[PDB]
Amino acid sequence: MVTIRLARHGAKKRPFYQVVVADSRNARNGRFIERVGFFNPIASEKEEGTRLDLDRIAHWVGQGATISDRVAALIKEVNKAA
Amino acid sequence: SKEKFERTKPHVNVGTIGHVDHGKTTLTAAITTVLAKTYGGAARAFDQIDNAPEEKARGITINTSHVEYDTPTRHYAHVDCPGAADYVKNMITGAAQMDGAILVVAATDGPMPQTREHILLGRQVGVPYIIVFLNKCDMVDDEELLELVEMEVRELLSQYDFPGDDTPIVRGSALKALEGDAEWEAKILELAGFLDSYIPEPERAIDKPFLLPIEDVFSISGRGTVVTGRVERGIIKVGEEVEIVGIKETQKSTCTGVEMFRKLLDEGRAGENVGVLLRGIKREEIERGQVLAKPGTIKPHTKFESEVYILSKDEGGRHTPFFKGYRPQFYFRTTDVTGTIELPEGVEMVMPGDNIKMVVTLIHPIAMDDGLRFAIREGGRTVGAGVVAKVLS
Amino acid sequence: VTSYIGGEGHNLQEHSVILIRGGRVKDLPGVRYHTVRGALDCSGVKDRKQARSKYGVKRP
Amino acid sequence: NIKSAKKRAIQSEKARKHNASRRSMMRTFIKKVYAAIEAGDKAAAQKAFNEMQPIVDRQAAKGLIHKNKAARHKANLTAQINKLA
Amino acid sequence: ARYLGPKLKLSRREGTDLFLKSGVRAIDTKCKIEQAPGQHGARKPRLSDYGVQLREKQKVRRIYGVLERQFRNYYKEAARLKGNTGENLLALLEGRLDNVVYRMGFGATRAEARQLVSHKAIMVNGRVVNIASYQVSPNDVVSIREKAKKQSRVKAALELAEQREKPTWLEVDAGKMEGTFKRKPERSDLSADINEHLIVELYSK
RNA sequence: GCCCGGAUAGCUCAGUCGGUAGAGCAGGGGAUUGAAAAUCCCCGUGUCCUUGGUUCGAUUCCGAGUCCGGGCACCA
RNA sequence: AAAUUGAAGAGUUUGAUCAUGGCUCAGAUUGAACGCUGGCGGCAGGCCUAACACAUGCAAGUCGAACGGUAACAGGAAGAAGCUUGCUUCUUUGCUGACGAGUGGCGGACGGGUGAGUAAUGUCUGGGAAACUGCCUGAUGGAGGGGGAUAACUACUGGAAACGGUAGCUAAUACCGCAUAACGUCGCAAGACCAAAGAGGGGGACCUUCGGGCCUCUUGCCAUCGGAUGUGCCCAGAUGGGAUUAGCUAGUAGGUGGGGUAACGGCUCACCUAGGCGACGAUCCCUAGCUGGUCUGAGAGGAUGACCAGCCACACUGGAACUGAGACACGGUCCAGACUCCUACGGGAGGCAGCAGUGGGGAAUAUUGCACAAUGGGCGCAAGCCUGAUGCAGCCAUGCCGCGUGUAUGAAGAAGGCCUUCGGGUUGUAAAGUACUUUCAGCGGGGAGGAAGGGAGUAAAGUUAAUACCUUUGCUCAUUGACGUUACCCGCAGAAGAAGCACCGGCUAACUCCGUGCCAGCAGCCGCGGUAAUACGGAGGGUGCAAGCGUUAAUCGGAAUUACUGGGCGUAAAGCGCACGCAGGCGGUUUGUUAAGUCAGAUGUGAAAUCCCCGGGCUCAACCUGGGAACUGCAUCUGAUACUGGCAA
Ligand SMILES: Nc1nc2c(ncn2[C@@H]2O[C@H](COP(=O)(O)OP(=O)(O)NP(=O)(O)O)[C@@H](O)[C@H]2O)c(=O)[nH]1
Ligand SMILES: [Mg+2]
Ligand SMILES: [Mg+2]
Ligand SMILES: [Mg+2]
Ligand SMILES: [Mg+2]
Ligand SMILES: [Mg+2]
Ligand SMILES: [Mg+2]
Ligand SMILES: [Mg+2]
Ligand SMILES: [Mg+2]
Ligand SMILES: [Mg+2]
Ligand SMILES: [Mg+2]
Ligand SMILES: [Mg+2]
Ligand SMILES: [Mg+2]
Ligand SMILES: [Mg+2]
Ligand SMILES: [Mg+2]
Ligand SMILES: [Mg+2]
Ligand SMILES: [Mg+2]
Ligand SMILES: [Mg+2]
Ligand SMILES: [Mg+2]
Ligand SMILES: [Mg+2]
Ligand SMILES: [Mg+2]
Ligand SMILES: [Mg+2]
Ligand SMILES: [Mg+2]
Ligand SMILES: [Mg+2]
Ligand SMILES: [Mg+2]
Ligand SMILES: [Mg+2]
Ligand SMILES: [Mg+2]
Ligand SMILES: [Mg+2]
Ligand SMILES: [Mg+2]
Ligand SMILES: [Mg+2]
Ligand SMILES: [Mg+2]
Ligand SMILES: [Mg+2]
Ligand SMILES: [Mg+2]
Ligand SMILES: [Mg+2]
Ligand SMILES: [Mg+2]
Ligand SMILES: [Mg+2]
Ligand SMILES: [Mg+2]
Ligand SMILES: [Mg+2]
Ligand SMILES: [Mg+2]
Ligand SMILES: [Mg+2]
Ligand SMILES: [Mg+2]
Ligand SMILES: [Mg+2]
Ligand SMILES: [Mg+2]
Ligand SMILES: [Mg+2]
Ligand SMILES: [Mg+2]
Ligand SMILES: [Mg+2]
Ligand SMILES: [Mg+2]
Ligand SMILES: [Mg+2]
Ligand SMILES: [Mg+2]
Ligand SMILES: [Mg+2]
Ligand SMILES: [Mg+2]
Ligand SMILES: [Mg+2]
Ligand SMILES: [Mg+2]
Ligand SMILES: [Mg+2]
Ligand SMILES: [Mg+2]
Ligand SMILES: [Mg+2]
Ligand SMILES: [Mg+2]
Ligand SMILES: [Mg+2]
Ligand SMILES: [Mg+2]
Ligand SMILES: [Mg+2]
Ligand SMILES: [Mg+2]
Ligand SMILES: [Mg+2]
Ligand SMILES: [Mg+2]
Ligand SMILES: [Mg+2]
Ligand SMILES: [Mg+2]
Ligand SMILES: [Mg+2]
Ligand SMILES: [Mg+2]
Ligand SMILES: [Mg+2]
Ligand SMILES: [Mg+2]
Ligand SMILES: [Mg+2]
Ligand SMILES: [Mg+2]
Ligand SMILES: [Mg+2]
Ligand SMILES: [Mg+2]
Ligand SMILES: [Mg+2]
Ligand SMILES: [Mg+2]
Ligand SMILES: [Mg+2]
Ligand SMILES: [Mg+2]
Ligand SMILES: [Mg+2]
Ligand SMILES: [Mg+2]
Ligand SMILES: [Mg+2]
Ligand SMILES: [Mg+2]
Ligand SMILES: [Mg+2]
Ligand SMILES: [Mg+2]
Ligand SMILES: [Mg+2]
Ligand SMILES: [Mg+2]
Ligand SMILES: [Mg+2]
Ligand SMILES: [Mg+2]
Ligand SMILES: [Mg+2]
Ligand SMILES: [Mg+2]
Ligand SMILES: [Mg+2]
Ligand SMILES: [Mg+2]
Ligand SMILES: [Mg+2]
Ligand SMILES: [Mg+2]
Ligand SMILES: [Mg+2]
Ligand SMILES: [Mg+2]
Ligand SMILES: [Mg+2]
Ligand SMILES: [Mg+2]
Ligand SMILES: [Mg+2]
Ligand SMILES: [Mg+2]
Ligand SMILES: [Mg+2]
Ligand SMILES: [Mg+2]
Ligand SMILES: [Mg+2]
Ligand SMILES: [Mg+2]
Ligand SMILES: [Mg+2]
Ligand SMILES: [Mg+2]
Ligand SMILES: [Mg+2]
Ligand SMILES: [Mg+2]
Ligand SMILES: [Mg+2]
Ligand SMILES: [Mg+2]
Ligand SMILES: [Mg+2]
Ligand SMILES: [Mg+2]
Ligand SMILES: [Mg+2]
Ligand SMILES: [Mg+2]
Ligand SMILES: [Mg+2]
Ligand SMILES: [Mg+2]
Ligand SMILES: [Mg+2]
Ligand SMILES: [Mg+2]
Ligand SMILES: [Mg+2]
Ligand SMILES: [Mg+2]
Ligand SMILES: [Mg+2]
Ligand SMILES: [Mg+2]
Ligand SMILES: [Mg+2]
Ligand SMILES: [Mg+2]
Ligand SMILES: [Mg+2]
Ligand SMILES: [Mg+2]
Ligand SMILES: [Mg+2]
Ligand SMILES: [Mg+2]
Ligand SMILES: [Mg+2]
Ligand SMILES: [Mg+2]
Ligand SMILES: [Mg+2]
Ligand SMILES: [Mg+2]
Ligand SMILES: [Mg+2]
Ligand SMILES: [Mg+2]
Ligand SMILES: [Mg+2]
Ligand SMILES: [Mg+2]
Ligand SMILES: [Mg+2]
Ligand SMILES: [Mg+2]
Ligand SMILES: [Mg+2]
Ligand SMILES: [Mg+2]
Ligand SMILES: [Mg+2]
Ligand SMILES: [Mg+2]
Ligand SMILES: [Mg+2]
Ligand SMILES: [Mg+2]
Ligand SMILES: [Mg+2]
Ligand SMILES: [Mg+2]
Ligand SMILES: [Mg+2]
Ligand SMILES: [Mg+2]
Ligand SMILES: [Mg+2]
Ligand SMILES: [Mg+2]
Ligand SMILES: [Mg+2]
Ligand SMILES: [Mg+2]
Ligand SMILES: [Mg+2]
Ligand SMILES: [Mg+2]
Ligand SMILES: [Mg+2]
Ligand SMILES: [Mg+2]
Ligand SMILES: [Mg+2]
Ligand SMILES: [Mg+2]
Ligand SMILES: [Mg+2]
Ligand SMILES: [Mg+2]
Ligand SMILES: [Mg+2]
Ligand SMILES: [Mg+2]
Ligand SMILES: [Mg+2]
Ligand SMILES: [Mg+2]
Ligand SMILES: [Mg+2]
Ligand SMILES: [Mg+2]
Ligand SMILES: [Mg+2]
Ligand SMILES: [Mg+2]
Ligand SMILES: [Mg+2]
Ligand SMILES: [Mg+2]
Ligand SMILES: [Mg+2]
Ligand SMILES: [Mg+2]
Ligand SMILES: [Mg+2]
Ligand SMILES: [Mg+2]
Ligand SMILES: [Mg+2]
Ligand SMILES: [Mg+2]
Ligand SMILES: [Mg+2]
Ligand SMILES: [Mg+2]
Ligand SMILES: [Mg+2]
Ligand SMILES: [Mg+2]
Ligand SMILES: [Mg+2]
Ligand SMILES: [Mg+2]
Ligand SMILES: [Mg+2]
Ligand SMILES: [Mg+2]
Ligand SMILES: [Mg+2]
Ligand SMILES: [Mg+2]
Ligand SMILES: [Mg+2]
Ligand SMILES: [Mg+2]
Ligand SMILES: [Mg+2]
Ligand SMILES: [Mg+2]
Ligand SMILES: [Mg+2]
Ligand SMILES: [Mg+2]
Ligand SMILES: [Mg+2]
Ligand SMILES: [Mg+2]
Ligand SMILES: [Mg+2]
Ligand SMILES: [Mg+2]
Ligand SMILES: [Mg+2]
Ligand SMILES: [Mg+2]
Ligand SMILES: [Mg+2]
Ligand SMILES: [Mg+2]
Ligand SMILES: [Mg+2]
Ligand SMILES: [Mg+2]
Ligand SMILES: [Mg+2]
Ligand SMILES: [Mg+2]
Ligand SMILES: [Mg+2]
Ligand SMILES: [Mg+2]
Ligand SMILES: [Mg+2]
Ligand SMILES: [Mg+2]
Ligand SMILES: [Mg+2]
8 A cells, every 4th residue: 555654863852754655564764755845843933834736646545545644644734725 | 680688687796716626617507406496587507607629629618708697686707717827818808807706615625725726816807706616515524524614615715804704604515406306405505695795886986987907808700800808987878889999999989788687788887797799890900908998088008107016025026126127017908918127216126026117118008087996917926916006198 | 924123121021911903014024913002901101191092101 | 583473383283194194185186197197098088177176176275285286287187188089 | 163272373383473362462473483393393394295285274264163064064155156166165254253353353363353243242133143254245344332432452452453464355433333345355356465276276185 | 519730031952869950952141233143252031930837947848829731420 | 147267386316416216295185093181063874894692671563433342440221139228239221431362454565784605696777568566546336135154252171381173153344155246367269257235323214023114424445448657578888896707608608488577588398490698708716795876086087985865685593484565574384404492301492684682703983761752664443552763862072163261450570490602682561460351161930932733612514304423614621842951042150161183304384491311202205313313312492283183094186107189109207120911090192972980959858965156944054945956867859961880993
């Protein structure tokens, strides 16, 4: 099963997640098909915070790829009309 | 290493003293089987007190073995000393930690040369109390012969400066109590009563900072190097900073579990024999004689002034003068060490039976402070007691 | 191998376990090592002040 | 061993007792056709083929045998019946 | 981390006045400058080509108060940056906060300005800064916080800055201890004495 | 934790059963050379591993140690 | 708009010289070690050697919404008995919630670890058909009617234990028929043949025989054709060293036919032919995980493959298969072997190259910590449980990077040291002294951000006979942090707690004086020391780095000293003693003509990280991070014909 999940990079106490389309069996930081945006929880109100390319999500979710508990919330965060 | 040791009943360090082949080790075995059966503690046996090839083909004991027998009032911790003339060095370590001895004189042979040598070492080191035990009895079926030996022991103790006539002498066979004779089982149950009555609750130093002299080092397969010894002062909590000071140099370390006869502890209090497990130390690099101190409290020294009291023929020591360059053995807390003597100006010779101060350069540095008590020995016998005056290094 | 004993005076004799580093002396032909003064049974040089990491001596 | 999922040891042993018996049954019905092949006309061989055809297809559906295994034992075995007889 | 030794000794060895012990008084005349580096001060040096490079490097270090490890890092940034390697070396040094705080006149010496930066006095763009090495970006506003504003060391040290040349690239208010760093410093604006070319020559080999 | 061996002037070795230890090879002093090497003329240059004891007297006889050698064990 | 801005020499053969040519040195760099000295912090890292041997706890379970269990356990409900009639005793009740032990599902094959083997079975780059694919996901349509078992539990025994047997007994999504089946499988087609499992949340109406049936809805089950993701297999080139290894090879090389493989194949057989590889290095021997990269370099190259990422390989040693969608299975099974193991002598264990930790080896390398709070993973509708994966914490200057250790004034140019032509100089504004700070430690108080959620509510929607239940939801509640005495802030006290260690003859920045006398010692190269040492030892003085500094080892550089870019061979090292000559390298000249080379274009690809440039975020930096460029390539496809090749003439 392909799944859209966060990768967890960044320094100690300073996380930075690469949301990424990968196989369930592969490790968190390991193999993936292609990365599809990112997430930064320690960004705060500034220029950049969270980006998520919604065109590539239709190629995976439309076919048959699950979305993780956190990445599903960021699709709600980016919104369809807000 | 599983069952947690509950801190109930005061801890007391007991141990057997006496002549060679006199019932000293066999007494220890009798005390276990007697106290385990009636009260209902842990059993154990005689063979465990001394196995190895060295204590089987021979029969004699070398190593200071330990035993843990419990009674309603107190929790005793035994120290079975060797006894022979060859093994006085590893005895003194066992005798120093011991609070109240159990002397062993026998009704057939009576007081013999080592009994005098053992009690002499007991005084100068630190043996407050002592209890006699006649360890044959049955072999000579007589009322007059057995009681004449009791008289000579009272004389021995009182001559060498102990209470003597006040000490509770006990009679009883060690081998008869090993099997199951009702009269002889009860007579060594009586010795447990004499231990509670005569010896008081010992005075500990649970206030001034941590110190622990190492009596014997181990290497436990799985956990690491362990050091045993009575905690001279202070306490030991698990995961605390501990500095090892003495011979060679000085090394930083941390405690990772204290124990009491293969049982876990939280706080290793003062005045009780405990096995401290140190972190990241090899078997060879940590040797016997070194002390587990709290960092900063004590510093290793190779030179010091000290008020030495030399002994005379009557008290038992040297009987001739000596000059700078003389090298005897200085027994501090556990181990001994050799050192050159440098006398003060205006003192041509040191006569026997005299009070003087002197600078002593030791070959190995040992951890010491001002007001530490030591006993000088040389040539298989005592020489002089004393105290440390000033640090130099 | 043979190894040079630098500094003035040494405690080495018969046996005594010592540490060896690389370095030719360029005078004794064949001797192509140096004993590390301070490490193991090889002690420091007695009464040195200048250059004491070389020769393994502590502060005064 | 040092695990409570040793059920799979006794469960897999329990499987192959069953799994070998249904497998052994299948390959004997296939042997029954190869026995009929050699000295025989188109009559006895095709009777054995009609008997094993339901058994080989069935065992393929249960995941014992793969569907291509079953497909060959029809493909090659019909070719022995058709070419010789 | 810092020098913290005899400071005017460094000036005699180098020869020229390094502004290490500039302080309240203008001119020193209290060290036998030039002709006494040490005991053997009367010894005229032969001074090789490697010497003059090393002397010029050690001069620029000791003026700005930077060690070789951090100074060699300025060269590595200076090489990668555009323009000229020589001009980049010194432009990056001048952009330090302890150097800017000195040039504004909030510190008699550069070591005083460094301590003033380190001890939570200095504040830039509404944010306190402790780091002397803080690269002051173009268009900034360094200043002193209101708790430590108009303390005894700063008011006297600001009167010294009137006698100084005063840079064109930065401006100072002087009333409320508020500075304004505007553009990057030009080569011809400052110094006109410390050679950059010889420092580029030391590191390239 | 205990059994055993080993140590003699700068180096390699003799000498002892209490009678106070020597040999070569070095090293040093002088005449000679810038200093040497030889040449010539004179010297052991010593805590008998350390220290104590039995004695009139101990390298030598008997303890206790030093660092090193090899041997056997104990698992809070 | 930005993506390379890049190439240094010096000492040393000689009385001197120019050349040749080694030797050494100045720079980067590390998984480092060692010596001396050690304040903090931040981010990284931390058994390279014995793939040596291992005690202890722990690293994989999970659902009651599969099933018997009316339950091992703890607790409500119809009813019971004592007596302080609600306090106590106590049988029934899926019936209180759940769940010890089972039975079945899915997991255990992922995640972790380590490079022993492997020089090609492997890896890389680019292609290619003969394939399979649990979970996810498109479509179509099923799922109908039966049976015999079987554990647990008893019952009864065997065993020291591990672990059984014998008598029942019973449940299912376990199990097997049967009907049922096609664009499915097979056949030339006609034909034949091939499956399923059921659950849970609610109900008006009417059957009640009360176990309700039947509407409901979510989820599962089953067949096919599919996507997606994995994996299996094939080819081409590339991927170390040795010819003081020259021949190797019989299922070997190919065919026909049978078997077997998910799939094709000497995969494997039977016969048939006599091959196949080999000088563009087979075979044999030694060494080796491989790549993205790393370090170095002006670049070509040279070295290297710790950490992060992909692939392979292996799991106590040597084998085999079972189960499964996937293993010939790290914490499964079965044998055998070596070593530890416990017993009752019958027999049993056991597998740290999961995480801690031990001994041993070594120059050398760490806690038997906390936590699932986040991020993934496993099962489950979920809640949650599980997780040494991950996130933290401890230790270690092992690195990279930041801030420390005061800051002004200060002449008697003090004392003391050190030097002197004894006039003085120098240490030295150094110190003391006065003026000030108060970072960081040390105390005392504020306090984020890592937190998205999940639940009890609800609202309309969803959904239906229904103002239900689930799908989506938006509003009200009270909560979720191992880190944590957190990041950071603010008050306190007072310079207070906070500096070494190399070197100083030349190369190479910096000099005197004493001690010693080819001795003691130094030395990276040359070389210093023989009684006036700048080189030895100390002292003063300096210089260079500074919480580091040096020494050692290791790679490249300089070395144009293996030279493709870029060297030579009369006398310095170096033309075989001289011919002939096959294979091989090269080839006059003009027409053709292809298009192999070559060149141009175009598309696909060259994983991500790394590097590089412009940004951005941590007080700054290292560090993290967005986008770009790049990934110098390889493939195919279209062209160009000058050159080179081919084929003619
Ligand atoms: N007849 C008899 N013999 C006894 C008695 N107690 C002890 N013994 C014997 O005396 C001998 C001494 O043995 P043991 O006690 O081990 O010696 P020890 O007293 O420890 N001295 P060491 O350890 O120095 O040899 C043994 O043979 C023992 O059986 C007793 O009461 N009666
Ligand atoms: Mg894989
Ligand atoms: Mg937020
Ligand atoms: Mg006797
Ligand atoms: Mg005994
Ligand atoms: Mg005896
Ligand atoms: Mg007798
Ligand atoms: Mg007698
Ligand atoms: Mg440890
Ligand atoms: Mg097993
Ligand atoms: Mg088994
Ligand atoms: Mg099955
Ligand atoms: Mg069969
Ligand atoms: Mg069969
Ligand atoms: Mg049929
Ligand atoms: Mg089945
Ligand atoms: Mg199946
Ligand atoms: Mg630094
Ligand atoms: Mg720094
Ligand atoms: Mg260069
Ligand atoms: Mg001579
Ligand atoms: Mg002479
Ligand atoms: Mg002479
Ligand atoms: Mg002479
Ligand atoms: Mg003369
Ligand atoms: Mg001489
Ligand atoms: Mg470049
Ligand atoms: Mg050169
Ligand atoms: Mg040169
Ligand atoms: Mg020559
Ligand atoms: Mg030369
Ligand atoms: Mg010359
Ligand atoms: Mg020349
Ligand atoms: Mg180190
Ligand atoms: Mg070190
Ligand atoms: Mg060390
Ligand atoms: Mg730190
Ligand atoms: Mg870390
Ligand atoms: Mg390893
Ligand atoms: Mg192995
Ligand atoms: Mg092992
Ligand atoms: Mg065990
Ligand atoms: Mg184990
Ligand atoms: Mg536990
Ligand atoms: Mg476990
Ligand atoms: Mg239920
Ligand atoms: Mg339910
Ligand atoms: Mg299944
Ligand atoms: Mg793995
Ligand atoms: Mg990992
Ligand atoms: Mg891994
Ligand atoms: Mg491991
Ligand atoms: Mg690797
Ligand atoms: Mg490939
Ligand atoms: Mg490829
Ligand atoms: Mg490809
Ligand atoms: Mg399918
Ligand atoms: Mg399945
Ligand atoms: Mg699922
Ligand atoms: Mg689906
Ligand atoms: Mg469907
Ligand atoms: Mg029907
Ligand atoms: Mg029917
Ligand atoms: Mg039915
Ligand atoms: Mg039925
Ligand atoms: Mg049935
Ligand atoms: Mg039945
Ligand atoms: Mg049955
Ligand atoms: Mg049934
Ligand atoms: Mg089924
Ligand atoms: Mg029918
Ligand atoms: Mg039928
Ligand atoms: Mg039917
Ligand atoms: Mg029908
Ligand atoms: Mg039909
Ligand atoms: Mg049909
Ligand atoms: Mg049909
Ligand atoms: Mg078909
Ligand atoms: Mg067909
Ligand atoms: Mg049809
Ligand atoms: Mg059915
Ligand atoms: Mg079924
Ligand atoms: Mg049901
Ligand atoms: Mg129901
Ligand atoms: Mg109903
Ligand atoms: Mg569905
Ligand atoms: Mg489904
Ligand atoms: Mg498909
Ligand atoms: Mg599918
Ligand atoms: Mg398969
Ligand atoms: Mg690279
Ligand atoms: Mg580089
Ligand atoms: Mg470069
Ligand atoms: Mg080059
Ligand atoms: Mg390689
Ligand atoms: Mg390699
Ligand atoms: Mg490496
Ligand atoms: Mg590794
Ligand atoms: Mg790591
Ligand atoms: Mg790792
Ligand atoms: Mg990896
Ligand atoms: Mg692969
Ligand atoms: Mg593969
Ligand atoms: Mg494998
Ligand atoms: Mg494997
Ligand atoms: Mg393993
Ligand atoms: Mg195996
Ligand atoms: Mg195997
Ligand atoms: Mg499966
Ligand atoms: Mg199978
Ligand atoms: Mg399959
Ligand atoms: Mg496994
Ligand atoms: Mg296996
Ligand atoms: Mg695995
Ligand atoms: Mg394991
Ligand atoms: Mg296994
Ligand atoms: Mg066999
Ligand atoms: Mg076996
Ligand atoms: Mg076995
Ligand atoms: Mg491990
Ligand atoms: Mg270890
Ligand atoms: Mg070791
Ligand atoms: Mg270390
Ligand atoms: Mg825990
Ligand atoms: Mg919890
Ligand atoms: Mg989770
Ligand atoms: Mg699930
Ligand atoms: Mg589900
Ligand atoms: Mg667990
Ligand atoms: Mg844990
Ligand atoms: Mg650090
Ligand atoms: Mg270190
Ligand atoms: Mg100070
Ligand atoms: Mg000052
Ligand atoms: Mg001052
Ligand atoms: Mg002061
Ligand atoms: Mg003041
Ligand atoms: Mg303050
Ligand atoms: Mg203040
Ligand atoms: Mg603070
Ligand atoms: Mg505090
Ligand atoms: Mg929230
Ligand atoms: Mg929070
Ligand atoms: Mg929810
Ligand atoms: Mg809810
Ligand atoms: Mg609710
Ligand atoms: Mg609701
Ligand atoms: Mg708090
Ligand atoms: Mg907490
Ligand atoms: Mg103050
Ligand atoms: Mg101070
Ligand atoms: Mg003199
Ligand atoms: Mg002389
Ligand atoms: Mg001489
Ligand atoms: Mg001499
Ligand atoms: Mg030197
Ligand atoms: Mg010469
Ligand atoms: Mg001279
Ligand atoms: Mg002189
Ligand atoms: Mg000289
Ligand atoms: Mg030099
Ligand atoms: Mg010198
Ligand atoms: Mg010197
Ligand atoms: Mg200086
Ligand atoms: Mg200095
Ligand atoms: Mg460093
Ligand atoms: Mg270094
Ligand atoms: Mg090197
Ligand atoms: Mg080269
Ligand atoms: Mg080279
Ligand atoms: Mg040449
Ligand atoms: Mg030629
Ligand atoms: Mg020649
Ligand atoms: Mg030639
Ligand atoms: Mg010729
Ligand atoms: Mg010839
Ligand atoms: Mg050609
Ligand atoms: Mg040609
Ligand atoms: Mg041509
Ligand atoms: Mg040709
Ligand atoms: Mg031509
Ligand atoms: Mg033409
Ligand atoms: Mg033409
Ligand atoms: Mg043409
Ligand atoms: Mg053409
Ligand atoms: Mg054409
Ligand atoms: Mg072409
Ligand atoms: Mg073409
Ligand atoms: Mg064409
Ligand atoms: Mg081409
Ligand atoms: Mg091209
Ligand atoms: Mg092209
Ligand atoms: Mg890339
Ligand atoms: Mg590169
Ligand atoms: Mg920034
Ligand atoms: Mg900024
Ligand atoms: Mg980036
Ligand atoms: Mg990018
Ligand atoms: Mg691009
Ligand atoms: Mg790349
Ligand atoms: Mg590349
Ligand atoms: Mg390309
Ligand atoms: Mg091509
Ligand atoms: Mg083409
Ligand atoms: Mg064409
Ligand atoms: Mg042409
Ligand atoms: Mg041509
Ligand atoms: Mg042509």
